[PDB]
Nucleic acid binder design. Sequence first.
RNA 1: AUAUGGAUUCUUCACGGUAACGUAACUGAAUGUGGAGACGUCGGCGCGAGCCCUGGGAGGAGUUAUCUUUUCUUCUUAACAGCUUAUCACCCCGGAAUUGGUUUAUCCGGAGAUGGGGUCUUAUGGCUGGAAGAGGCCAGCACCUUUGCUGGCUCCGGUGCGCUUGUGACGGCCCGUGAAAAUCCACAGGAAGGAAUAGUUUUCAUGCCAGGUCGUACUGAUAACCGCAGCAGGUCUCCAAGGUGAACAGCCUCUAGUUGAUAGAAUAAUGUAGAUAAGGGAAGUCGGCAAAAUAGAUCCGUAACUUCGGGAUAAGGAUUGGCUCUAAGGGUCGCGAUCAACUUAGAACUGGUACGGACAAGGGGAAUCUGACUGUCUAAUUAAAACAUAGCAUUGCGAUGGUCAGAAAGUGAUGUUGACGCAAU
RNA 2: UUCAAAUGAGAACUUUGAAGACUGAAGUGGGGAAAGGUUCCACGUCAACAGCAGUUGGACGUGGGUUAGUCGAUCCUAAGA
Lengths: 77, 97, 109, 91, 114
Amino acid sequence: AREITDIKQFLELTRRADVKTATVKINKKLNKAGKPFRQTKFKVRGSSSLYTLVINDAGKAKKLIQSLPPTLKVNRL
Amino acid sequence: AKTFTVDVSSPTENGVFDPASYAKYLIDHIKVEGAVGNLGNAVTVTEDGTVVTVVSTAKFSGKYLKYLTKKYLKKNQLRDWIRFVSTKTNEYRLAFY
Amino acid sequence: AQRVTFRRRNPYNTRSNKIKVVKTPGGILRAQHVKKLATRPKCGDCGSALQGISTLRPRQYATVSKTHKTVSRAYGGSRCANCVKERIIRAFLIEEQKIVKKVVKEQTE
Amino acid sequence: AKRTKKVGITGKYGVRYGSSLRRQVKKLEIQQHARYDCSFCGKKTVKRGAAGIWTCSCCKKTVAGGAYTVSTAAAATVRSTIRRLREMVEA
Amino acid sequence: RAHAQSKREGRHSGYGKRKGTREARLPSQVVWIRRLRVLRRLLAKYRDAGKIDKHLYHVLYKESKGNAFKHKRALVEHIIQAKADAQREKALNEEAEARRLKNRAARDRRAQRV
RNA sequence: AUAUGGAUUCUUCACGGUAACGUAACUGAAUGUGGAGACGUCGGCGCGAGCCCUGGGAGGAGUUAUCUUUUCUUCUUAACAGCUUAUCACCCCGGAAUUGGUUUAUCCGGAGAUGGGGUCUUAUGGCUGGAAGAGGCCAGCACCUUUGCUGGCUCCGGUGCGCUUGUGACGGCCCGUGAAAAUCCACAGGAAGGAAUAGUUUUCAUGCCAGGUCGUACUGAUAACCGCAGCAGGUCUCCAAGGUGAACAGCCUCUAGUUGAUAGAAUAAUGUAGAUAAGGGAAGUCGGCAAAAUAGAUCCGUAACUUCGGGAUAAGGAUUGGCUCUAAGGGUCGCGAUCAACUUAGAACUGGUACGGACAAGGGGAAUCUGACUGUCUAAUUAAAACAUAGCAUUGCGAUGGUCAGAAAGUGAUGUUGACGCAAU
RNA sequence: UUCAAAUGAGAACUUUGAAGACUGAAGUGGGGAAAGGUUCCACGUCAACAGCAGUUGGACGUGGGUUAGUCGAUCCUAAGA
Ligand SMILES: [K+]
Ligand SMILES: [Mg+2]
Ligand SMILES: [Mg+2]
Ligand SMILES: [Mg+2]
Ligand SMILES: [Mg+2]
Ligand SMILES: [Mg+2]
Ligand SMILES: [Mg+2]
Ligand SMILES: [Mg+2]
Ligand SMILES: [Mg+2]
Ligand SMILES: [Mg+2]
Ligand SMILES: [Mg+2]
Ligand SMILES: [Mg+2]
Ligand SMILES: [Mg+2]
Ligand SMILES: [Mg+2]
Ligand SMILES: [Mg+2]
Ligand SMILES: [Mg+2]
Ligand SMILES: [Mg+2]
Ligand SMILES: [Mg+2]
Ligand SMILES: [Mg+2]
Ligand SMILES: [Mg+2]
Ligand SMILES: [Mg+2]
Ligand SMILES: [Mg+2]
Ligand SMILES: [Mg+2]
Ligand SMILES: [Mg+2]
Ligand SMILES: [Mg+2]
Ligand SMILES: [Mg+2]
Ligand SMILES: [Mg+2]
Ligand SMILES: [Mg+2]
Ligand SMILES: [Mg+2]
Ligand SMILES: [Mg+2]
Ligand SMILES: [Mg+2]
Ligand SMILES: [Mg+2]
Ligand SMILES: [Mg+2]
Ligand SMILES: [Mg+2]
Ligand SMILES: [Zn+2]
Ligand SMILES: [Zn+2]
């Protein structure tokens, strides 16, 4: 398992053409102030590694959810 | 300040319970800095007939509240019919059965 | 307290049967067998541990890139920097003295 | 404070083995555990490994020596004899 | 827990409650390590803050390796006493210098004005 | 097996850093060299992990005549991956006596200390991914079935001569210096192969395929093994909670396990095992056999003799509970603030003068014979003064040899040896 | 060791519940090595065996069960053969 922070590189990973499945996981975290912000993990299943991109902003998370290719088996939750 | 609520509606409407005496017992027996009775401007126990509220600035916990409630129920022979049950964090109720 | 068992059939506390007690995501204590620790590669001239060289078991060095096993200098992951410098100085000075000895021999005859 | 009058390092042996044997052992243990002057780097850092091996903790040079002392009197005499014979051979 | 609290208060520790030797209960080496470490760290703190110079630090380091100091308080009072002694001796030096120079000035003035 | 991407090349086989060295890569045959594999034991010290102890909070349970913000319990995070993280070691600057630095342990420095700034190994720890979706703990539900849900919380700290264990830097010891090989890597070298409508690189990333065979249950012992047996015997090893206490002792308890030994009824003699005893105190007996007495810790005090190391816990005295106090012994931050754990000493008070209250736990002394000591043996009647031992001495032998094997050998042990040795006493 | 229930023709000995105890982490706990070889587990089941008993069993009868590129062997060498 590997973590990725570059959004463009994560998109290339979703387009790598050996990646057939992904999963979008939603967390209910607190960023050290007590209010329950919503974290999103995008995990694309590569052949040898599972790549996880963590976005703490639900807006960018929704943008990436839209930006995922429509051949990916997105697997919400 | 922390708030702890206790829903006593079920035993109250089943008849064998008294929220006023439960609140009075809480006021009488809540300890502050080791000493009982001195809830001076730090612990308030209020009654609404269906919800007892405890608001605390001093050291107080849901565990301590449950301890006191179980003590009250035992003194009044109310256990085996009334359980102190946490429904949400710091929101409890008296399940009656 | 929770007590653990060996996970292999080796029941003896040998050098290859060392274990560490780890806590799992199941909340329970379990032995995990630990490999023997790696020894640092050492200088072939002075025997000191080579700086900048990864320390792995022997066959693990086949699974890592050249950068982990070498140093960018005349003897890399074989000789330490000070030993290499001594080799440079000795080579240069002895070669110069060889020239001096040759000319002294030629001019003493 | 001085802890023992005469046994020194052989106080580890207690009352055993005889005073004469303990004394004989004491002389050679003091010799073999002493630090000696390194003839290469000039420091008092030469200590024994196994018998006859004397290594400097500084400069890492090791020399073959006596069992319990860096240089035996016999070896020094042999060194002088060889020096004399060599000087006669070369001059 | 109650017995532990009582022992913290100091009960159940008399001679009739001890069955191991004093060393077995708490090693003198452990006590010495604690004391010498607090002394060395205080000496380092004083030297780094400039309360003592490195030469007095070295003297006190050798003395602390020797027994020579029962505790941190003993070391601190020793340092304070040394500094106060230096202050008094320097004050006497300055006072004597001033008196000598003033008397010599009076003498020189008298001579050169006679 | 492989094709992209990356990297590299017009200065063909990379750049950066004074350096220690850094990196995503960054040609390298023969041959050579080096490293890893790869190594004792003990002692203290440092660090880590797990455990133990403990605070707050969020749950569940127990006790509640009285008391108890209480007693118990859940609150966890794998291999693997990225970033980061050490002691040691090293580099640059600089040039040190008023010698300084410094460990619990006294080592280090003009062969360059201290100091300032850096580099490195990644044991190890932190954060993140794995991963909360898992596991744990709860609550509200439905329930002729498969049983299904629905939610909530799974958080934040502290402490240490603690236990177990890993590890580091050291130190002690030896007439003892404490495997080997497979295997893997690196370096030296420079054979060879190499670029411009292009060459080079599967030690960089990603991608594709395959990984056979045999074992794998269970016991591992007061019933799975051996002992004729379901035998009180024997049989190698890992983990290891709380209290008391020096303690892996004894005693009690938690987790787990067991409650299995043919039973019932009586309580004669004689037994076996366990105890007690007035007065006397070894008069018993071959003989104090057996038993008793002593016993922990603190303080005091300690003879002859001696190989000066011991004898020694010699001998011989005193004290010890509980409670309420007093004093001293630390960390961190900027004298003050804050945090923290035990050990020691003393005092008053107190009691049927008890108090190492059970448990646990030396009897001592004056001498003679004997063997120096530690050690070893008659498994199953002898543990000794016997044997061994270090020490001492004698003997043979210089290898075409001494001593000793073999039926013989173009055969062996000593001998991977060499008189400071081997062999025989 | 005890009480009760269940099962059974039959219960001191089986099962469940209750209680009282013990091992007391150098275990009467949890795993293994050698050895054993199916004793493991289920169902049925008591003539023999478990030096009383037996409805129970390591017994009897019938079946089920041991899944590996990563744990071992396999490979290396050791004394040696
Ligand atoms: K490197
Ligand atoms: Mg590296
Ligand atoms: Mg101790
Ligand atoms: Mg000491
Ligand atoms: Mg580059
Ligand atoms: Mg320096
Ligand atoms: Mg151990
Ligand atoms: Mg198994
Ligand atoms: Mg098993
Ligand atoms: Mg067992
Ligand atoms: Mg048998
Ligand atoms: Mg204790
Ligand atoms: Mg009597
Ligand atoms: Mg009497
Ligand atoms: Mg008498
Ligand atoms: Mg008589
Ligand atoms: Mg008689
Ligand atoms: Mg007689
Ligand atoms: Mg006797
Ligand atoms: Mg005495
Ligand atoms: Mg005596
Ligand atoms: Mg003897
Ligand atoms: Mg016998
Ligand atoms: Mg005998
Ligand atoms: Mg003899
Ligand atoms: Mg039962
Ligand atoms: Mg017992
Ligand atoms: Mg017990
Ligand atoms: Mg069975
Ligand atoms: Mg029978
Ligand atoms: Mg029968
Ligand atoms: Mg039947
Ligand atoms: Mg069968
Ligand atoms: Mg393997
Ligand atoms: Zn070197
Ligand atoms: Zn030297």
